[PDB]
Coordinates of C-alpha atoms in Angstrom, one line a residue:
Chain H
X1 CA -4.5 136.9 -99.9
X2 CA -1.4 136.1 -97.8
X3 CA 1.4 138.4 -99.0
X4 CA 5.0 139.2 -98.0
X5 CA 6.7 142.3 -99.5
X6 CA 10.4 142.8 -98.8
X7 CA 12.4 146.0 -99.3
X8 CA 15.6 147.7 -97.9
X9 CA 18.0 145.8 -100.1
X10 CA 20.8 147.5 -102.0
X11 CA 24.6 148.1 -102.2
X12 CA 26.7 148.5 -99.1
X13 CA 30.4 148.4 -98.6
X14 CA 32.3 145.7 -96.3
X15 CA 31.7 146.5 -92.6
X16 CA 28.6 148.4 -93.6
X17 CA 25.1 148.0 -92.2
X18 CA 21.6 147.5 -93.7
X19 CA 18.1 146.9 -92.4
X20 CA 15.7 144.7 -94.4
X21 CA 11.9 145.0 -94.0
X22 CA 9.2 142.4 -94.8
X23 CA 5.6 143.9 -94.8
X24 CA 3.0 141.2 -94.3
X25 CA -0.7 141.0 -95.2
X26 CA -3.4 138.4 -94.7
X27 CA -1.9 137.2 -91.4
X28 CA -0.4 138.6 -88.1
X29 CA 3.5 138.4 -87.9
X30 CA 3.4 138.5 -84.0
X31 CA 1.5 135.2 -83.7
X32 CA 3.6 133.3 -86.4
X33 CA 7.0 131.7 -86.9
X34 CA 8.8 134.0 -89.4
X35 CA 12.2 133.3 -91.0
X36 CA 14.9 134.9 -93.3
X37 CA 16.4 132.6 -96.0
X38 CA 19.1 133.9 -98.4
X39 CA 20.4 132.7 -101.7
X40 CA 23.8 133.9 -103.1
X41 CA 23.9 134.3 -107.0
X42 CA 23.8 130.9 -108.6
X43 CA 24.0 129.2 -105.1
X44 CA 21.7 127.2 -102.8
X45 CA 19.2 128.3 -100.1
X46 CA 20.7 129.2 -96.8
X47 CA 18.7 129.6 -93.6
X48 CA 19.6 132.8 -91.8
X49 CA 17.3 133.5 -88.9
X50 CA 13.9 132.8 -87.2
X51 CA 11.6 134.5 -84.7
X52 CA 9.1 132.2 -83.0
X53 CA 5.5 133.3 -82.2
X54 CA 6.5 133.5 -78.5
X55 CA 9.6 135.7 -79.2
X56 CA 12.5 133.2 -79.2
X57 CA 15.2 134.0 -81.8
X58 CA 17.7 131.6 -83.6
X59 CA 20.5 132.4 -86.1
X60 CA 22.8 130.5 -88.4
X61 CA 26.4 130.4 -87.1
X62 CA 27.6 132.5 -90.2
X63 CA 25.5 135.6 -89.1
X64 CA 25.5 135.1 -85.3
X65 CA 26.4 138.4 -83.5
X66 CA 26.0 140.4 -86.7
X67 CA 22.3 139.9 -87.7
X68 CA 19.3 140.7 -85.5
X69 CA 15.8 139.6 -86.4
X70 CA 12.8 141.5 -84.9
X71 CA 9.2 142.5 -85.6
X72 CA 6.8 145.5 -85.2
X73 CA 3.3 144.4 -84.3
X74 CA 1.6 147.7 -85.2
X75 CA 3.2 147.9 -88.6
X76 CA 2.8 144.0 -89.1
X77 CA 6.4 144.0 -90.4
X78 CA 9.4 141.7 -90.0
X79 CA 13.0 143.1 -89.9
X80 CA 16.5 141.8 -90.4
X81 CA 19.2 144.2 -89.0
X82 CA 22.5 143.3 -90.7
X83 CA 25.8 144.7 -89.3
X84 CA 29.5 144.2 -90.2
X85 CA 28.5 143.0 -93.6
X86 CA 31.0 140.9 -95.6
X87 CA 31.4 140.1 -99.3
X88 CA 29.9 136.5 -98.7
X89 CA 26.6 138.1 -97.4
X90 CA 25.8 139.1 -101.0
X91 CA 22.4 137.2 -101.7
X92 CA 18.7 137.6 -102.5
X93 CA 17.1 137.7 -99.0
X94 CA 13.7 136.0 -98.7
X95 CA 11.1 136.5 -96.0
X96 CA 9.1 133.4 -95.2
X97 CA 6.1 132.4 -93.1
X98 CA 6.5 129.0 -91.5
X99 CA 3.9 126.2 -91.2
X100 CA 4.2 122.9 -89.3
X101 CA 7.7 121.9 -88.2
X102 CA 9.5 124.9 -89.8
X103 CA 8.1 124.2 -93.3
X104 CA 8.3 127.4 -95.3
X105 CA 4.7 127.7 -96.6
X106 CA 4.8 131.3 -97.9
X107 CA 7.7 133.2 -99.4
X108 CA 8.3 136.8 -100.5
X109 CA 9.9 137.5 -103.9
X110 CA 13.2 138.5 -102.3
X111 CA 15.4 141.6 -101.9
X112 CA 18.9 141.8 -103.3
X113 CA 21.9 142.8 -101.0
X114 CA 25.3 143.4 -102.6
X115 CA 28.4 143.8 -100.3
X116 CA 31.4 145.1 -102.4
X117 CA 34.4 147.4 -102.0
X118 CA 34.4 148.0 -105.9
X119 CA 33.4 151.5 -107.0
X120 CA 29.8 152.2 -108.1
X121 CA 29.5 153.0 -111.8
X122 CA 26.3 154.3 -113.5
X123 CA 25.4 153.0 -116.9
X124 CA 25.7 154.8 -120.4
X125 CA 22.3 154.4 -122.2
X126 CA 22.2 154.1 -126.0
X127 CA 19.2 153.6 -128.3
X128 CA 18.9 150.5 -130.5
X129 CA 17.0 152.1 -133.5
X130 CA 14.8 149.8 -135.6
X131 CA 16.4 149.4 -139.1
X132 CA 14.6 149.5 -142.6
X137 CA 7.6 142.1 -142.3
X138 CA 4.9 143.3 -139.9
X139 CA 7.0 143.9 -136.8
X140 CA 10.1 145.9 -135.8
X141 CA 12.5 145.4 -132.9
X142 CA 13.9 148.4 -131.1
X143 CA 15.6 148.7 -127.7
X144 CA 18.2 150.2 -125.4
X145 CA 21.7 149.2 -124.6
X146 CA 22.6 149.7 -120.9
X147 CA 26.4 149.8 -121.0
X148 CA 29.1 149.5 -118.3
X149 CA 27.5 149.6 -114.8
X150 CA 28.4 148.1 -111.4
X151 CA 26.7 146.5 -109.4
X152 CA 23.6 144.7 -110.4
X153 CA 20.7 145.4 -110.9
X154 CA 19.3 147.8 -113.4
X155 CA 15.5 147.9 -114.1
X156 CA 14.2 148.9 -117.5
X157 CA 10.6 150.0 -118.3
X158 CA 9.1 151.3 -121.5
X159 CA 7.0 154.6 -121.8
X160 CA 6.9 154.8 -117.9
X161 CA 5.2 151.4 -117.6
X162 CA 2.5 152.0 -120.3
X163 CA 4.3 149.6 -122.8
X164 CA 4.6 146.0 -121.4
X165 CA 3.6 143.8 -124.4
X166 CA 6.6 142.3 -126.3
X167 CA 9.2 143.8 -123.9
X168 CA 12.2 141.5 -123.2
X169 CA 15.0 142.8 -120.9
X170 CA 17.8 140.3 -121.3
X171 CA 20.0 139.0 -118.5
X172 CA 23.2 141.1 -118.0
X173 CA 26.6 140.1 -119.2
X174 CA 29.5 140.4 -116.7
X175 CA 32.4 141.6 -118.8
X176 CA 36.3 141.1 -118.3
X177 CA 36.5 144.7 -117.0
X178 CA 34.2 143.7 -114.0
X179 CA 31.4 145.9 -115.4
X180 CA 27.9 144.7 -116.5
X181 CA 26.0 145.5 -119.7
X182 CA 22.4 144.6 -120.6
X183 CA 19.8 145.2 -123.4
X184 CA 16.0 145.6 -123.3
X185 CA 14.2 145.1 -126.6
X186 CA 10.5 145.7 -127.5
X187 CA 8.8 144.1 -130.6
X188 CA 6.4 146.6 -132.0
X189 CA 4.2 147.0 -135.2
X190 CA 6.2 148.7 -138.0
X191 CA 3.3 151.0 -138.9
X192 CA 3.7 152.6 -135.4
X193 CA 7.3 153.8 -136.0
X194 CA 6.5 157.1 -137.6
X195 CA 4.1 158.1 -134.8
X196 CA 4.5 156.2 -131.5
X197 CA 7.1 157.6 -129.1
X198 CA 9.4 154.9 -127.5
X199 CA 11.3 155.8 -124.3
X200 CA 13.2 153.3 -122.2
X201 CA 13.3 154.3 -118.5
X202 CA 16.6 153.0 -117.0
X203 CA 17.0 153.0 -113.2
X204 CA 20.3 152.1 -111.5
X205 CA 19.7 152.8 -107.8
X206 CA 23.3 152.3 -106.4
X207 CA 24.6 155.2 -108.6
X208 CA 21.2 157.1 -108.3
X209 CA 20.9 156.9 -112.2
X210 CA 17.5 157.7 -113.6
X211 CA 17.7 158.1 -117.4
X212 CA 15.0 158.2 -120.0
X213 CA 16.2 157.5 -123.6
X214 CA 14.2 158.2 -126.8
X215 CA 14.4 155.3 -129.4
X216 CA 13.6 157.0 -132.8
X217 CA 14.0 155.4 -136.3
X218 CA 17.4 156.2 -137.9
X219 CA 17.9 158.6 -140.9
Chain M
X1 CA -0.7 107.2 -64.7
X2 CA -2.3 108.3 -68.0
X3 CA -3.4 111.9 -68.0
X4 CA -6.5 113.4 -69.7
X5 CA -5.7 116.3 -72.0
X6 CA -7.4 119.0 -69.9
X7 CA -6.2 117.3 -66.6
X8 CA -2.5 117.6 -67.9
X9 CA -3.1 121.2 -69.1
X10 CA -4.3 122.2 -65.5
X11 CA -1.3 120.3 -63.9
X12 CA 1.2 121.9 -66.3
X13 CA -0.3 125.4 -65.6
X14 CA 0.1 124.8 -61.8
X15 CA 3.8 123.9 -62.4
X16 CA 4.4 127.3 -64.2
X17 CA 4.9 126.1 -67.8
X18 CA 2.5 128.6 -69.4
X19 CA 4.8 131.0 -71.4
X20 CA 7.9 129.4 -69.7
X21 CA 10.9 130.5 -72.0
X22 CA 8.3 132.0 -74.4
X23 CA 6.3 128.8 -75.0
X24 CA 2.5 129.1 -74.4
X25 CA 0.9 126.2 -72.4
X26 CA -0.6 124.5 -75.5
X27 CA 3.0 123.7 -76.7
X28 CA 3.7 121.7 -73.6
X29 CA 0.4 119.7 -73.7
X30 CA 1.0 119.0 -77.5
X31 CA 4.6 117.9 -76.8
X32 CA 3.5 115.4 -74.0
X33 CA 0.7 114.1 -76.3
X34 CA 3.1 113.2 -79.2
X35 CA 6.1 112.2 -76.9
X36 CA 4.4 109.9 -74.4
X37 CA 0.7 109.9 -75.2
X38 CA 0.1 111.5 -71.7
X39 CA 1.6 108.4 -70.0
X40 CA 3.9 109.3 -67.0
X41 CA 5.3 105.7 -67.1
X42 CA 6.3 105.8 -70.9
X43 CA 9.8 104.4 -71.2
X44 CA 11.6 104.2 -74.6
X45 CA 15.0 102.5 -75.0
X46 CA 17.3 103.7 -77.8
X47 CA 19.9 101.7 -79.8
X48 CA 22.7 104.0 -78.4
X49 CA 22.1 102.7 -74.9
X50 CA 20.1 105.6 -73.6
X51 CA 16.4 105.6 -72.5
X52 CA 13.8 108.4 -72.7
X53 CA 11.7 108.6 -69.5
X54 CA 8.2 109.8 -68.6
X55 CA 5.5 112.2 -69.8
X56 CA 8.0 114.4 -71.6
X57 CA 10.5 111.6 -72.6
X58 CA 13.6 112.9 -70.9
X59 CA 16.9 111.3 -72.2
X60 CA 19.3 109.4 -69.9
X61 CA 22.5 110.3 -71.8
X62 CA 22.2 114.1 -71.1
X63 CA 19.6 114.9 -68.5
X64 CA 18.9 112.1 -65.9
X65 CA 20.9 109.2 -64.4
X66 CA 19.6 105.6 -64.8
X67 CA 23.0 104.0 -64.2
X68 CA 22.8 102.1 -67.6
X69 CA 24.0 104.8 -70.1
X70 CA 27.7 105.0 -71.1
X71 CA 28.9 108.6 -70.9
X72 CA 25.9 109.9 -68.9
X73 CA 25.9 113.6 -67.9
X74 CA 22.9 114.0 -65.5
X75 CA 22.4 117.7 -66.2
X76 CA 19.1 117.8 -64.2
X77 CA 20.8 116.1 -61.2
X78 CA 18.0 113.4 -60.7
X79 CA 17.5 109.7 -61.0
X80 CA 15.5 108.8 -64.2
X81 CA 13.0 106.9 -61.8
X82 CA 11.9 110.4 -60.4
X83 CA 10.7 111.1 -64.0
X84 CA 8.2 108.2 -63.9
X85 CA 6.2 109.6 -61.0
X86 CA 2.4 110.3 -61.2
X87 CA 3.6 113.8 -59.8
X88 CA 4.9 115.7 -62.9
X89 CA 7.1 118.1 -60.7
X90 CA 10.4 116.4 -61.5
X91 CA 9.6 116.1 -65.2
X92 CA 8.5 119.8 -65.3
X93 CA 11.7 121.0 -63.5
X94 CA 13.9 119.0 -65.8
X95 CA 11.9 120.2 -69.0
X96 CA 12.5 123.9 -67.8
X97 CA 16.2 123.2 -67.9
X98 CA 16.1 121.3 -71.3
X99 CA 14.1 124.1 -72.9
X100 CA 17.0 126.5 -71.8
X101 CA 19.8 124.4 -73.5
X102 CA 20.5 125.8 -77.0
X103 CA 17.5 124.2 -78.9
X104 CA 14.3 125.5 -77.2
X105 CA 11.4 123.1 -77.5
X106 CA 13.0 121.5 -80.6
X107 CA 14.9 119.3 -78.0
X108 CA 11.5 117.3 -78.2
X109 CA 11.7 115.9 -81.8
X110 CA 7.9 115.3 -81.7
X111 CA 7.2 118.9 -80.7
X112 CA 9.2 120.2 -83.7
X113 CA 7.4 117.8 -86.1
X114 CA 3.8 117.9 -84.8
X115 CA 3.4 121.1 -82.7
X116 CA 5.9 123.8 -83.8
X117 CA 4.0 126.3 -86.1
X118 CA 0.5 124.8 -85.5
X119 CA -2.6 126.1 -83.6
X120 CA -1.1 124.7 -80.3
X121 CA -3.8 126.5 -78.2
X122 CA -6.4 124.0 -79.6
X123 CA -4.7 121.6 -77.0
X124 CA -6.0 123.8 -74.1
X125 CA -9.3 124.7 -75.8
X126 CA -12.4 123.7 -73.9
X127 CA -10.5 123.2 -70.7
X128 CA -11.6 125.0 -67.5
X129 CA -8.2 126.5 -66.6
Chain E
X2 CA 27.7 119.2 -95.5
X3 CA 24.8 118.8 -93.0
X4 CA 22.3 117.6 -95.8
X5 CA 23.6 116.3 -99.1
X6 CA 21.8 116.1 -102.4
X7 CA 23.2 115.1 -105.9
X8 CA 24.0 118.4 -107.7
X9 CA 22.2 117.2 -110.9
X10 CA 19.5 114.7 -111.9
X11 CA 18.2 114.1 -115.4
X12 CA 15.4 112.0 -117.0
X13 CA 13.3 111.8 -120.2
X14 CA 9.6 112.9 -120.5
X15 CA 7.4 110.1 -119.0
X16 CA 10.3 108.7 -116.9
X17 CA 10.4 108.2 -113.1
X18 CA 13.3 110.0 -111.3
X19 CA 14.3 110.3 -107.7
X20 CA 16.4 112.9 -105.8
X21 CA 18.1 111.7 -102.6
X22 CA 18.7 113.7 -99.4
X23 CA 21.3 112.4 -97.0
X24 CA 21.4 113.7 -93.5
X25 CA 23.1 112.9 -90.3
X26 CA 22.3 111.7 -86.7
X27 CA 21.7 115.3 -85.6
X28 CA 19.0 116.0 -88.2
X29 CA 17.1 113.3 -90.3
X30 CA 18.6 110.5 -88.1
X31 CA 17.4 112.3 -84.9
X32 CA 13.8 112.0 -86.2
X33 CA 13.4 115.5 -87.7
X34 CA 10.9 115.6 -90.7
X35 CA 12.2 116.5 -94.1
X36 CA 10.5 119.1 -96.3
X37 CA 11.0 119.6 -100.1
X38 CA 10.9 122.8 -102.2
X39 CA 10.7 123.4 -105.9
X40 CA 12.4 126.5 -107.2
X41 CA 11.3 127.5 -110.8
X42 CA 13.8 129.9 -112.6
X43 CA 13.5 133.6 -111.7
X44 CA 11.1 132.6 -108.8
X45 CA 11.2 132.2 -105.0
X46 CA 11.1 128.5 -103.7
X47 CA 7.6 126.9 -103.2
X48 CA 6.8 124.1 -100.7
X49 CA 6.5 120.8 -102.6
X50 CA 6.4 118.1 -99.8
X51 CA 5.9 118.7 -96.0
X52 CA 6.4 116.3 -93.1
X53 CA 8.2 113.7 -95.2
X54 CA 5.2 112.6 -97.4
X55 CA 2.5 115.3 -97.5
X56 CA 1.6 117.2 -100.6
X57 CA 0.4 120.8 -100.1
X58 CA -2.6 122.0 -102.3
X59 CA -1.8 122.1 -106.1
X60 CA 1.1 119.7 -106.0
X61 CA 0.4 116.8 -108.4
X62 CA 0.2 113.1 -107.2
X63 CA 3.3 112.3 -109.4
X64 CA 5.4 114.0 -106.7
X65 CA 6.1 111.7 -103.7
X66 CA 8.4 111.7 -100.6
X67 CA 9.9 108.9 -98.5
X68 CA 12.1 109.0 -95.4
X69 CA 13.8 106.4 -93.2
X70 CA 16.9 106.4 -91.0
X71 CA 19.3 109.3 -92.0
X72 CA 17.9 109.7 -95.5
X73 CA 14.9 111.0 -97.5
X74 CA 13.9 110.9 -101.2
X75 CA 11.8 112.8 -103.6
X76 CA 10.3 110.7 -106.4
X77 CA 8.8 112.3 -109.6
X78 CA 6.8 109.9 -111.9
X79 CA 5.6 110.9 -115.4
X80 CA 8.4 113.6 -115.9
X81 CA 7.2 116.7 -117.8
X82 CA 9.1 119.7 -119.2
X83 CA 7.4 121.9 -116.4
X84 CA 9.3 119.8 -113.8
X85 CA 12.7 121.4 -114.7
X86 CA 13.7 123.3 -111.6
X87 CA 16.1 123.3 -108.6
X88 CA 14.9 121.0 -105.8
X89 CA 15.9 121.4 -102.1
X90 CA 15.3 119.2 -99.1
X91 CA 15.1 120.8 -95.6
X92 CA 15.2 119.5 -92.1
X93 CA 16.1 120.7 -88.5
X94 CA 19.5 120.1 -87.0
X95 CA 19.8 119.9 -83.1
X96 CA 23.6 120.4 -83.1
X97 CA 23.4 123.7 -85.1
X98 CA 20.0 124.6 -83.4
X99 CA 18.1 125.6 -86.5
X100 CA 16.5 124.8 -89.9
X101 CA 19.0 123.4 -92.5
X102 CA 18.8 123.0 -96.4
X103 CA 20.5 120.5 -98.7
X104 CA 22.7 122.0 -101.4
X105 CA 20.0 121.6 -104.1
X106 CA 19.5 119.4 -107.2
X107 CA 19.0 120.8 -110.7
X108 CA 16.5 118.7 -112.6
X109 CA 16.9 118.4 -116.4
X110 CA 14.1 116.9 -118.6
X111 CA 16.1 115.6 -121.6
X112 CA 13.8 115.0 -124.6
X113 CA 11.3 117.9 -124.1
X114 CA 10.4 119.7 -127.4
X115 CA 13.4 121.4 -129.1
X116 CA 13.1 125.2 -129.8
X117 CA 15.2 127.0 -132.4
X118 CA 16.8 130.4 -131.3
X119 CA 15.5 133.8 -132.7
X120 CA 18.3 136.2 -133.3
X121 CA 18.3 140.1 -133.4
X122 CA 21.6 141.9 -134.3
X123 CA 22.0 145.7 -133.7
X124 CA 24.8 147.8 -135.1
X125 CA 26.5 150.5 -133.0
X126 CA 24.2 153.5 -132.5
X127 CA 25.2 156.9 -134.0
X128 CA 25.0 158.3 -130.4
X129 CA 27.7 155.7 -129.3
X130 CA 29.8 156.4 -132.5
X131 CA 29.6 160.2 -131.8
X132 CA 31.0 159.3 -128.3
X133 CA 33.9 157.5 -130.1
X134 CA 32.8 154.0 -129.1
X135 CA 31.2 151.0 -130.9
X136 CA 29.2 147.9 -129.6
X137 CA 27.4 145.3 -131.7
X138 CA 24.5 143.7 -129.8
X139 CA 23.4 140.1 -130.6
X140 CA 20.3 139.0 -128.8
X141 CA 19.4 135.3 -128.8
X142 CA 16.0 134.2 -127.5
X143 CA 13.4 131.3 -127.2
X144 CA 15.8 128.4 -127.4
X145 CA 15.7 124.8 -125.9
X146 CA 18.1 123.1 -124.8
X147 CA 20.4 125.8 -123.3
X148 CA 23.5 125.0 -125.2
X149 CA 24.5 127.6 -127.9
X150 CA 27.8 128.7 -129.6
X151 CA 28.1 132.3 -130.8
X152 CA 30.5 133.0 -133.7
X153 CA 31.2 136.6 -134.8
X154 CA 32.5 137.5 -138.3
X155 CA 34.0 140.7 -139.8
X156 CA 33.4 140.1 -143.5
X157 CA 34.5 136.4 -143.8
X158 CA 37.0 136.4 -140.9
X159 CA 36.1 135.1 -137.4
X160 CA 36.3 137.7 -134.6
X161 CA 37.1 136.7 -131.0
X162 CA 38.7 139.9 -129.5
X163 CA 36.2 142.1 -127.6
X164 CA 33.5 139.4 -127.5
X165 CA 31.4 139.1 -124.2
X166 CA 28.8 136.3 -124.2
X167 CA 26.4 135.4 -121.4
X168 CA 25.9 131.9 -120.1
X169 CA 22.3 131.1 -121.2
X170 CA 19.5 131.4 -118.6
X171 CA 15.7 130.7 -118.5
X172 CA 13.0 133.3 -119.6
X173 CA 9.4 133.3 -118.1
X174 CA 8.2 131.0 -120.9
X175 CA 10.6 128.2 -119.8
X176 CA 12.9 128.7 -122.9
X177 CA 16.4 130.2 -122.8
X178 CA 17.9 133.6 -123.6
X179 CA 21.5 134.7 -124.2
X180 CA 23.3 137.9 -125.4
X181 CA 26.6 138.5 -127.2
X182 CA 28.5 141.8 -127.3
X183 CA 31.2 142.8 -129.7
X184 CA 33.2 145.9 -128.8
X185 CA 35.1 147.6 -131.6
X186 CA 36.6 151.0 -132.2
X187 CA 34.6 153.3 -134.7
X188 CA 37.6 152.8 -137.1
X189 CA 37.3 148.9 -136.9
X190 CA 33.5 149.1 -137.5
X191 CA 34.0 151.3 -140.7
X192 CA 36.9 149.2 -142.1
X193 CA 34.6 146.1 -143.0
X194 CA 31.7 145.7 -145.5
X195 CA 29.8 143.6 -142.9
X196 CA 29.6 142.1 -139.5
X197 CA 27.8 138.8 -138.7
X198 CA 26.6 137.1 -135.5
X199 CA 26.0 133.4 -136.0
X200 CA 24.3 131.2 -133.5
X201 CA 24.8 127.4 -133.6
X202 CA 22.1 125.4 -131.6
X203 CA 22.2 121.6 -132.0
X204 CA 22.6 121.1 -135.8
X205 CA 20.9 124.5 -136.6
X206 CA 22.5 127.9 -137.6
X207 CA 20.8 131.3 -137.5
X208 CA 22.9 134.3 -138.8
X209 CA 22.2 138.0 -138.8
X210 CA 24.3 140.6 -140.6
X211 CA 24.8 144.4 -140.2
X212 CA 26.5 146.7 -142.7
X213 CA 28.5 149.9 -141.8
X214 CA 27.2 151.6 -145.0
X215 CA 23.9 151.5 -143.0

């Protein structure tokens, strides 16, 4: 019943600004201790900021004077205004509801924030046609993009069973590549349409690719 | 003197602690319960040479002067003896200063552990304030 | 650091393990309670222990906490495969004026059931070849432990140029996945009778082959 939904994350350049939101349900943000915790890729948890039920605010020294925590009582939403963003601010940002003694009892799923001066590159999408017992594997190659992430869906969300989107590879070039593969019944190949929907928000890329059997 | 829960809540409200520095009254009552068990004469000596005095357990290294602590600061400009009075005025006035130092009510270790993020207003519930 | 944890801890199924959390006089040593968190792969952290020793709802009895002086510990008895995760201790520091986390401990359960990798190899698509590019896609899934070696071959010759391989990471099912990419020119692709992607995992080998003749 208690839910925390964060949004507002994305790519921004050094010195840039971004505002994160955390929409709450099943409790009132105004009468609770709410906090922001971040986690840089492959790194540990780092406490960022807190807002007490009474309105007092506290910040980690690393974001002091740059980040501002606040809440909107009518919208039951928590905010994190981030200014003068630096490369080292790149992390998954979690919204948390505190329990007794600043224990973090409920966490959101996190929103990714990337701070980079590198140029944004949209991916090139290629079908991975099933070749010629009972099942066939087909997919999409999402080639040479920056930064992370890319989301892949199949048949606009209709196809979910046997879908595996693999973690991306970070190549020598500095560009990423990933693949998404769906295991399907071989008898469906002549009839069922398979479209991978690739979304890369930083480059505003929204591409649908038909994966048909080869001839 | 050992205060009753509601008796202390009334006294603390009369000394302007309700919402002082954004902390509702129940936070103050809860902090005194877990710090001194509502005893104005509670005295706790620490291994470092400092002592915590009274109902809100105010520390002799930073806030009050007891003349026993090496490197004492006396930031509340009061003898530690004034903090053992049955009259909470001196303890309240010093707590108002402590809560304004960079830690908020976290300065009271027992408040952070037992009161912070709990239903603190249960500590003033049933009282005729 | 303000809170220190060992970067890694390992034990066998059924074993008792403990993860230490070393604080200072401004946090644990000041009397501030320690909280513990378990972070499963691809998931947000979840509260495991609160107020030094308390278990929230759903946390098994095999998880216990202890705390005295400037240190706290997390003990795990009857270690199971499901315990593999990143563990974090947390306290409050009065010098920094805020909540503080330890660096985290990665827990490995050495001896849980071994799972052989499944391999899918894709040749370059005609769409990519028509664009004068070529990529071979080798997808490795459902393996445990996470260590794998990928060896690419053009006929019987090993190929290392233009190879990009991921560091393996956990899937939702608690098994690993990895990918290997071999970039070639359309001319290089057409010059060989076959290309192979071979995955070595413990003493096992799974190999898939693609032929440019189609």
